[PDB]
Amino acid sequence: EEASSTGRNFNVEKINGEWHTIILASDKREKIEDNGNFRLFLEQIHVLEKSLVLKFHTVRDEECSELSMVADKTEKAGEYSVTYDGFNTFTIPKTDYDNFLMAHLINEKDGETFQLMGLYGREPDLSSDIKERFAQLCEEHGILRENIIDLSNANRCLQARE
Length: 162
Known about the structure:
Number of helices: 1
Helix content: under 10%
Function: Binds pheromones that are released from drying urine of males. These pheromones affect the sexual behavior of females.
CATH architecture: Beta Barrel
Organism: Mus musculus (Mouse)
Main location: secreted
Distance between the termini: 26 Å
GO biological process, one term: heat generation
Largest sheet: 9 strands, antiparallel
Shape: globular
Order of helices and strands: EEEEEEEEEH
CATH superfamily: Calycin beta-barrel core domain
Keywords: Disulfide bond, Pheromone-binding, Secreted, Signal, Transport
CATH class: Mainly Beta
Strand order of the largest sheet: 1-3-4-5-6-7-8-9-2
Number of domains: 1
């Protein structure tokens, strides 16, 4: 049961709780790499009926700290905007609220805009057939397989082991 966020069949309350970065893939191929702005491990989605508070994580030379993304409702519960490195207009197309969550982010920065598509999960690593559904969705929007770095372990405070 994978719901579309903007309408038809969606509560916001079900996407509230523990959520983890599984694969993080950028159209640029510099944001997701070593010492870049979007190499960020998800900690929780804190749901307010108003703003999706996406509490991410960075490791600051061994020191474990959270990065709060307060994303207010611009066009309904679904299309949310957060100002972080530009203007981050994201829809959530395939959200399962039990195993997985696919979120498509389009990041606008002064007439130069990059699409960054992330696989997220209740578990800190997911199964290979769910990751195959993410790679078919990334190809459909427009992100190549040469950029796809699988961030489920690499800079994680919980356990760095597959």
